[PDB]
């Protein structure tokens, strides 16, 4: 079986489309396993499954290299997963959004955003209520 183990290792290079693709996933994801392409989202993330792998490693995503104008070749972030794939990736369901698409609503964000903390787009809290006490404004004409 020592030979069959090495053949599988060689098949992983082919499975990732040559040495360059093999080395790209090794340096981006530290993992060279070949899985079945479940689907791809509009941001370029690709989703894979392998049900021979133990629970937890049987589903994974390879993050896009560019999201919402940000270079994500090296800077991948868990918040980059859009909600419709988030349910499948965390095993809250067995159905990927390709098979069971989410219900469409007009107010649902068409474009997902990742964590914006520490950027100019960060959230800044403020009071959403209006002024409660109105001050008297003195007249603009003298008559002391």
């Amino acid at each position: 079986e020592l030979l069959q183990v090495l053949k599988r290792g060689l098949q992983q290079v082919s499975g990732h489309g040559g040495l360059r693709g093999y080395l790209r996933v090794l340096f981006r994801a530290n993992d060279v396993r070949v899985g079945t392409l479940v689907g791809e989202d509009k941001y370029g993330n690709k989703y894979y499954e392998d049900n021979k792998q133990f629970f937890g490693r049987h589903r994974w995503v390879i993050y896009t290299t560019e999201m919402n104008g940000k270079n994500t070749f090296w800077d991948v972030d868990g918040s980059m997963v859009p909600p419709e794939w988030h349910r499948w990736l965390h095993c809250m369901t067995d159905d990927p959004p390709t098979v069971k698409p989410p219900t469409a609503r007009k107010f649902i964000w068409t474009n997902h955003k990742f964590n914006l903390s520490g950027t100019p787009q960060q959230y800044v809290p403020y009071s959403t209520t209006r002024k409660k006490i109105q001050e008297w404004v003195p007249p603009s004409t003298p008559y002391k």
Partner: protein, 176 residues
């Protein structure tokens, strides 16, 4: 009913005494312990490849809060303040008035996410499924102020995560 965990007399016959002597001098139990850690060396590890792989969660998972809408886009929240009353941490602050169309709606809906204990009592109390704990848990910040959510922040979370939140509620509402 009980059992003794450590109530035994060692056999004092020569064969048993030599067995204990061999264990003492030849370190046999220690070698057996080394076998166990050796066996683990050749076991597949239990580590998952975060953030490329994620820990399994269920539809009930209590994560980041969000305010929801009806299919029309109208807010579900009617400013009943039941969430604010039940909140064990007093993490919710609400103000309300008649909206320009006469509707009963909030003008303030703040959740201090650093007071909140992520207990889910607010989403149990809500009569109209307006406030929920969503499935997101990856929203750490560089400042304290970014974790003091106002209504705008919470409505955006609702518009951001509704696709998943609606599916999770579908999976679990028959348990509620």
């Amino acid at each position: 009913t009980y059992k003794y965990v450590n109530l035994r007399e060692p056999s004092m016959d020569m064969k048993s005494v030599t067995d204990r002597a061999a264990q003492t001098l030849l370190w046999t139990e220690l070698i057996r312990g080394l076998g166990m850690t050796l066996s683990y060396l050749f076991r597949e590890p239990a580590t998952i490849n975060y953030p490329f792989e994620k820990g399994p969660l269920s539809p009930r998972f209590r994560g980041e809060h969000a305010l929801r809408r009806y299919p029309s886009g109208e807010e579900r929240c009617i400013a009943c303040k039941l969430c604010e009353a039940v909140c064990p941490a007093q993490a919710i602050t609400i103000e309300a008035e008649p909206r320009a169309d006469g509707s009963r709606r909030t003008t303030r809906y703040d959740i201090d996410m650093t007071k909140c204990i992520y207990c889910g009592f607010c989403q149990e109390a809500c009569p109209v499924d307006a406030i929920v704990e969503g499935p997101n848990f990856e929203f750490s910040t560089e400042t304290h102020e970014e974790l003091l959510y106002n209504k705008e922040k919470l409505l955006n979370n609702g518009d951001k995560w509704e696709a998943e939140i609606a599916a999770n509620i579908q999976a679990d509402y028959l348990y509620r």
